[PDB]
């Protein structure tokens, strides 16, 4: 049942959370967002971490996973996405949905 549901989150929200694990820095997820003319797809893969920062407030880390992407894929990404999404970012937990929506709207251009 959990896999039918993950499939639905993929088609409803254009995102898949592949796995989650807890390590020495915090709680992590491996994520891909975007959509699949059959050559037209726009996808970003990233790690998302939830870490205790100052005062034990959970901060979010975004780390894009760009090593295996081709130059053609990166050019397309860079033409759709804001420049900050090509480096590691930190942002407040309260901005998490805004972050998702920024990538989503950008990928859907």
């Amino acid at each position: 049942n959990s896999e039918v549901i993950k499939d639905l989150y993929e088609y409803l929200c254009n995102v898949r959370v592949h796995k989650s694990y807890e390590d020495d820095s915090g709680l992590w997820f491996d994520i891909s967002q975007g959509t699949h003319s059959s050559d037209d797809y726009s996808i970003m893969d990233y790690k998302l971490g939830f870490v205790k920062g100052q005062a034990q407030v959970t901060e979010v880390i975004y780390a894009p996973v760009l090593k295996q992407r081709s130059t053609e894929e990166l050019y397309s990404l860079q033409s759709k996405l804001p420049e900050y999404l090509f480096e590691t970012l930190s942002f407040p937990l309260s901005s998490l949905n805004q972050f998702y929506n920024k990538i989503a709207k950008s990928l859907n251009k």
Binding site: E10, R16, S32, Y41, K47, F91, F99, K105
Partner: protein
């Protein structure tokens, strides 16, 4: 057939993470719409 003519899915992106470790961040407070 299905590996070739089936609908692509984000499930196959798991491979993108192979060899990447989570072990210097630009801080952003909010993202516009």
């Amino acid at each position: 057939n299905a590996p070739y003519f089936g609908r692509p899915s984000l499930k196959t992106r798991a491979k993108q993470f192979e060899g990447v470790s989570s072990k210097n961040c630009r801080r952003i407070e909010a993202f516009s719409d």
